[PDB]
Amino acid sequence: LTQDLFLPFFSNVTWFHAIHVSGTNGIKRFDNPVLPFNDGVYFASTEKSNIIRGWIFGTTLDSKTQSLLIVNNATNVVIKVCEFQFCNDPFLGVYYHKNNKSWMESEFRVYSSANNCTFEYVSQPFLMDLEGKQGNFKNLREFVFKNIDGYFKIYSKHTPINLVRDLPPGFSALEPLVDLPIGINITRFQTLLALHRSYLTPGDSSSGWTAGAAAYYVGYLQPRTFLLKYNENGTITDAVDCALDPLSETKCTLKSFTVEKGIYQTSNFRVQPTDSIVRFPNITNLCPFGEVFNATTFASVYAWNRKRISNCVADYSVLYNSTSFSTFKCYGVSPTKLNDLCFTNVYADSFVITGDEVRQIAPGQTGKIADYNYKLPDDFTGCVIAWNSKHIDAKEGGNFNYLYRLFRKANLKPFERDISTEIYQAGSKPCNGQTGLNCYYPLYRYGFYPTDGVGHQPYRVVVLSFELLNAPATVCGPKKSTNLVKNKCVNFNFNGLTGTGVLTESNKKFLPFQQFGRDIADTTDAVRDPQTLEILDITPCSFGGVSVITPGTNASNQVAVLYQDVNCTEVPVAIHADQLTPTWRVYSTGSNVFQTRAGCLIGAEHVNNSYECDIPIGAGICASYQTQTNSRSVASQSIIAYTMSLGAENSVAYSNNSIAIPTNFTISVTTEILPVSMTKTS
Amino acid sequence: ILSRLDPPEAEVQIDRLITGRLQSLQTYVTQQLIRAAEIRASANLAATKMSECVLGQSKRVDFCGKGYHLMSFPQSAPHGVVFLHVTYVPAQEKNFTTAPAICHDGKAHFPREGVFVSNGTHWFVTQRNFYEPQIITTDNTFVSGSCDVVIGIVNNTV
Amino acid sequence: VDCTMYICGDSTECSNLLLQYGSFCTQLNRALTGIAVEQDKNTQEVFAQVKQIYKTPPIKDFGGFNFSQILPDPSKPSKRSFIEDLLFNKVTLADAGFIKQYGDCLGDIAARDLICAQKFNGLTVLPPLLTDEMIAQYTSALLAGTITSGWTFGAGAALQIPFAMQMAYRFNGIGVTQNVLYENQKLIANQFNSAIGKIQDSLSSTASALGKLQDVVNQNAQALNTLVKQLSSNFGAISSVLNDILSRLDPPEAEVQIDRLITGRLQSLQTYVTQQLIRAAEIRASANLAATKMSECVLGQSKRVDFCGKGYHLMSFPQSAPHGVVFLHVTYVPAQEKNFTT
Amino acid sequence: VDCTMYICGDSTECSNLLLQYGSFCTQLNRALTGIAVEQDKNTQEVFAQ
Amino acid sequence: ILSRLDPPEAEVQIDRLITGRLQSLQTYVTQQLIRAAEIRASANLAATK
Ligand SMILES: *[C@@H]1O[C@H](CO)[C@@H](O[C@@H]2O[C@H](CO)[C@@H](O)[C@H](O)[C@H]2NC(C)=O)[C@H](O)[C@H]1NC(C)=O
Ligand SMILES: *[C@@H]1O[C@H](CO)[C@@H](O[C@@H]2O[C@H](CO)[C@@H](O)[C@H](O)[C@H]2NC(C)=O)[C@H](O)[C@H]1NC(C)=O
Ligand SMILES: *[C@@H]1O[C@H](CO)[C@@H](O[C@@H]2O[C@H](CO)[C@@H](O)[C@H](O)[C@H]2NC(C)=O)[C@H](O)[C@H]1NC(C)=O
Ligand SMILES: *[C@@H]1O[C@H](CO)[C@@H](O)[C@H](O)[C@H]1NC(C)=O
Ligand SMILES: *[C@@H]1O[C@H](CO)[C@@H](O)[C@H](O)[C@H]1NC(C)=O
Ligand SMILES: *[C@@H]1O[C@H](CO)[C@@H](O)[C@H](O)[C@H]1NC(C)=O
Ligand SMILES: *[C@@H]1O[C@H](CO)[C@@H](O)[C@H](O)[C@H]1NC(C)=O
Ligand SMILES: *[C@@H]1O[C@H](CO)[C@@H](O)[C@H](O)[C@H]1NC(C)=O
Ligand SMILES: *[C@@H]1O[C@H](CO)[C@@H](O)[C@H](O)[C@H]1NC(C)=O
Ligand SMILES: *[C@@H]1O[C@H](CO)[C@@H](O)[C@H](O)[C@H]1NC(C)=O
Ligand SMILES: *[C@@H]1O[C@H](CO)[C@@H](O)[C@H](O)[C@H]1NC(C)=O
Ligand SMILES: *[C@@H]1O[C@H](CO)[C@@H](O)[C@H](O)[C@H]1NC(C)=O
Ligand SMILES: *[C@@H]1O[C@H](CO)[C@@H](O)[C@H](O)[C@H]1NC(C)=O
Ligand SMILES: *[C@@H]1O[C@H](CO)[C@@H](O)[C@H](O)[C@H]1NC(C)=O
């Protein structure tokens, strides 16, 4: 059972055609458009004439961007990642020529130029080709293309069929062909057709060539959960789309392909959020990194000059050619998330030390700096930035600013400053404020020459300290805000606080500074939109309480669903039916919706009779799978829902002076089975 | 883990497997203890049912069978036992007219092992579980007090 | 319990990490469903002894015994007895017994109720198969069968017998000849009608039926509230909020903090399920005891001492209660002890 | 069972980490006290007939 | 642990001990519940006898 990008079962597949000028009654056509890629593509093609040759992959399909090309010509297949300048209508060259010294001279009519080629791959030709007949597509070829983490992955299958205009039903398992390390951003694609009749095009500008009714199918992959069945050889022989219908959802909570007669509580394989949301406040102003990082003088390490950074946008991109950072270490936050976060408070803490002491600006360090000068705390939650600055802090005579402390009677506490400049008697004799035997002035000046080892060269350190409170945000990242879809089970990110649920207008009242509210369980249940100040509450995307009633997969495939504690009119709103597959909405609305005391039962025909209970639904209702041959003519079996009976109703003829006395007996022998032991194990 | 990582780093991954496998074993043992209790209860019930249905005849209702218990036979089964309960089950249920304490000779007459059924204009006495009527004699009956019983019909009591 | 909704919520990142972690979910739910069907089997074994729904006779006096307080009242929609109506009130049942629809927690104005603090976290409460009106149909059939047949309907078909003519044998069974009843029939019927009046008025003052039935209602409700509150435990992670970890840290570092939460919450679920199994055993024992007491006190007359009542057992009447049953045991209790020489 | 004395002993550092960890201790003790009163109820039901 | 390591690194080692000892307490309490049930059964049998 895996979550990955799969082609959903019974999903929409677009059907494209070609000219068939020799079969369309003297009528042609040219249509192989450019299609999106969309996280992966499923391509199928029933063909007989070997007109499909390959594909193009890329984004702009120009020389200003690299692209990928696949051409199976006859012997060997050619895969190139060069910089192609494709034509507006690309196709392959020659078709054939009989004894004219021009047999199979295939010239590329695809691109005007190819340059800066990075990848080149040649191997044996795909499934089959060079067939020529009609009225039968003797070969169905399927392909799945993926492009993840730099690799281009192709999976294919080749099966023999004979149909006319149908993508034949059935199960399909494609095997891996190639994983190519091409590493290119791919957004669009297009198909290569072989259209030629002794020449590529007509005499001057028309097709007027061989067009053998090219037709292919295109489907797109979606993030889904599948249950695959591997055989002895490791070949996938069966699968279940957990998000297809209530029966598949049941075969996924019970990881099995067969289900017994009963009622089953079910996990949520149903909805998937499709779009995300960013709602950041109006800051529109960049932080003063040009004056914080790039200043004439920095503070001394012992006088380290904390300053704060209020409303501004934190975009570290501006310093990419401005400065090079030798140290950039973040605590309590990851460096790749600094763009998606908003902070309520920020501080700076700039100073200058030597290059060998930059390691002492970590939380649990010891040393001259970490003991007497700076002392970061234990729960820091910030980033530490450092960079060599010998070009501004070193002078040819020496730079004797930037003092530092060397003698202190006790270690500094976290974030404590000290400028005491007293005399520090080291022995036991009194000091009298005079530098003498065991009395040293405690501050000493660094000496920063340009002819120094990289361990004695000056380094500028900046220690950003931020917090994440329920206050309004002051510093935000460079994320760009999107719109506000507020009904449709989206991913959201408001002030760096992410999540996934259903947004909805709320009636809760927040304090003026509050940005979100929690529940008894520490889960965000309401958030304030920082762009409209509106409070709106969050609802989980998953609806629990769905039980699926089945008569057994080896008996039938129709089921009934029970939505526990849901009004029958609010079922499509509770399960988000509009976001479900069409085979799910069959069980949200219905011809036969029955409102039990437990919940809404959709899929079973409520009868007025009563029987002994077969499958217990609850609250007095049971359900069974009964035929209707006596209920209707040529009627098939279905699922009925009735109120179970407690037995035959009876009455006793009681009176003052009447007794019933038996005249005959009936010796009966009944059995009783009792387990006495169980298997003992060690 | 032991092929790719060195002992210092492999110990971190192994300690996770050790913890989870110990928890898997703990869960198994707890479930086994619970089921062993549930089956010891049934084994005690079966040890009671044997000594009270096979080595005797129980007056407890619905304990050995359904009707009035007569006898029982044990049969061994895999990890269990089967009891064949033989009961009585009276079944013909014919109505009669009855009354207590027939009043004869100025004194009440109650039956011992009887209910005082009545034919058409004729009165008899029967045991409760089987229609077998006798004549109301001095040994089918005992006498106590005057005729104040709430019905007390009149009869002969020969 | 929906496993992913409790542990992960709506988190494809967490829902992906819970997959490769383990398959405990299926094991945890197998145990909870075995408990659920046992709760229906208990009620069946206690109340569905007889499969004949005997109608209550139109007569309402049986040699002086009133029975009007223990027989079903046809006025109000619930066809329960006066005392059964009195019993369903002393038990608060401040839980999901009182239905809370899903629309009640979608549209909310103040703060989320606990009933759907656990609903939104994957903890549902399934309703019992037998309606409380079906339990009352079963008890009313047993009372009718008893007061109109005595021993007979438990051992076979119901054989009609006059009531006072039946209590004569009930007296013969405890060692008291028949005439003692007929000679004290009016006093005996009066002592019977007074004791039921006393239990009626005593079931309105002290709330003592709350003893064992409310105790199991409070236990189950409290376990779910504990399971909910335990979602704010850190278990060694930097936070108990999953969307806080997922906002600040990257997948490589967020997986270390998430795996701690996954382990802690799986442990919390396992503890809940183990406690539920233990309590289900303790309540199956009581349900078996009640199924024995019904067939041995209501469908018969037991010679076992202190099994059906205190004195010498005469008869018993069942009354349905929320998640339980009440037995009205009628005994003999001789009280005078005058001395003699023997 | 006193929870902190078993797990942490006398350790304000540990006693502070056990706080934010979780509240199992309270549920653990709820179970042990239910057992303890049952041991008295057993003896009563057997001997105080 | 508290003598050699600092709070940031000592908390990693302490949380392992906390988890292990909490599990040890939970195992004890579960076994006690099971034995309390097994002995309540015998006490009920003795109160019947
Ligand atoms: C069809 O594919 C074949 C696969 O071999 C290719 O033939 C190559 O032709 C180029 C010139 O375009 C030669 O330099 C190579 O020597 C040929 N391949 C070999 C044997 O290595 C070619 O890409 C396609 N078209 C032609 C011309 O056949
Ligand atoms: C991509 O192709 C372009 C165009 O040829 C290359 O740009 C030229 O590269 C040549 C070879 O060194 C230089 O002599 C020219 O001065 C470049 N022209 C310009 C205007 O840039 C470019 O180098 C190629 N890039 C890669 C990655 O190979
Ligand atoms: C904070 O200052 C206090 C008082 O100045 C320091 O405590 C004194 O430390 C000196 C030298 O170790 C002793 O001679 C005094 O007896 C201490 N006084 C008291 C009141 O205890 C303390 O060391 C300083 N703490 C830090 C970390 O700077
Ligand atoms: C899918 O196909 C159906 C049936 O032809 C059509 O009604 C619907 O518009 C299609 N949807 C998409 C997304 O193409
Ligand atoms: C596995 O492969 C072999 C040969 O490739 C084939 O004969 C067999 O049928 C396949 N399936 C099995 C062994 O289940
Ligand atoms: C960035 O750095 C390069 C290299 O020194 C320099 O040529 C350029 O002027 C700088 N600024 C910009 C905006 O590229
Ligand atoms: C940095 O300081 C220098 C001073 O030499 C100045 O010329 C420059 O504009 C400042 N900003 C950047 C981004 O370099
Ligand atoms: C923020 O921007 C939005 C649109 O850009 C505007 O409607 C709003 O008034 C601005 N101010 C606040 C405080 O949201
Ligand atoms: C269901 O909704 C309808 C219309 O909103 C209402 O009349 C009915 O009372 C509701 N029933 C329940 C059980 O919510
Ligand atoms: C069931 O009975 C009700 C009561 O009159 C009636 O309204 C309903 O139409 C009946 N349904 C069927 C399917 O017979
Ligand atoms: C007579 O007996 C039959 C069955 O034996 C029973 O149904 C009936 O109620 C009894 N009484 C009368 C008055 O028929
Ligand atoms: C009792 O019932 C049996 C059942 O077949 C029958 O053969 C027998 O004659 C009956 N005894 C009578 C009517 O006395
Ligand atoms: C029977 O009980 C009813 C209701 O409690 C009471 O009013 C009446 O006095 C009693 N007497 C009868 C009618 O038997
Ligand atoms: C006589 O009976 C009374 C109570 O009925 C009792 O207390 C007393 O011990 C008996 N014997 C004597 C000798 O009083």
Author numbering:
A (entry chain A): 50 to 731
B (entry chain A): 976 to 1133
C (entry chain C): 732 to 1073
D (entry chain B): 732 to 780
E (entry chain B): 976 to 1024
Report text from the authors:
Coronavirus RaTG13, detected in the horseshoe bat Rhinolophus affinis in China’s Yunnan province, was identified as the closest relative of the SARS-CoV-25. The spike and RBD of RaTG13 and SARS-CoV-2 share 97.5% and 89.2% amino acid sequence identity, respectively. Here we report the cryo-EM structures of the RaTG13 and PCoV_GX spikes at 2.93 Å and 2.48 Å resolution, respectively. The high-resolution density maps enabled us to build nearly all residues of the PCoV_GX spike (residues 14–1138) with 93 N-linked glycans and the RaTG13 spike (residues 14–1133) with 54 N-linked glycans. In the RaTG13 spike, one RBD contacts 28 residues and the N165/N234/N370-linked glycans from the counter-clockwise monomer, and 13 residues from the clockwise monomer. However, the RaTG13 RBD bound to hACE2 with a much weaker affinity of 500 nM. To experimentally investigate important sites for different binding strength of hACE2 with the RaTG13 and SARS-CoV-2 RBDs, we generated six single-site mutants of the RaTG13 RBD (F449Y, L486F, Y493Q, Y498Q, D501N, and H505Y) by changing residues at these sites to corresponding residues of the SARS-CoV-2. The SPR experiments showed that the D501N mutation resulted in the most significant increase (~9 fold) of the binding strength with hACE2 (KD = 57.4 nM) among all six mutations. The SARS-CoV-2 RBD-hACE2 complex structure revealed that at the 449 site, SARS-CoV-2 RBD has a tyrosine forming two hydrogen bonds with hACE2 D38 and Q42 upon binding. This tyrosine is conserved in the PCoV_GX RBD but is replaced by a phenylalanine in the RaTG13 RBD, which is expected to disrupt the hydrogen-bonding interactions. Although the pocket and interacting RBD residues are conserved, the LA did not bind to the RaTG13 spike purified from insect cells in our study, as well as to the RaTG13 spike purified from HEK293 cells in another study.
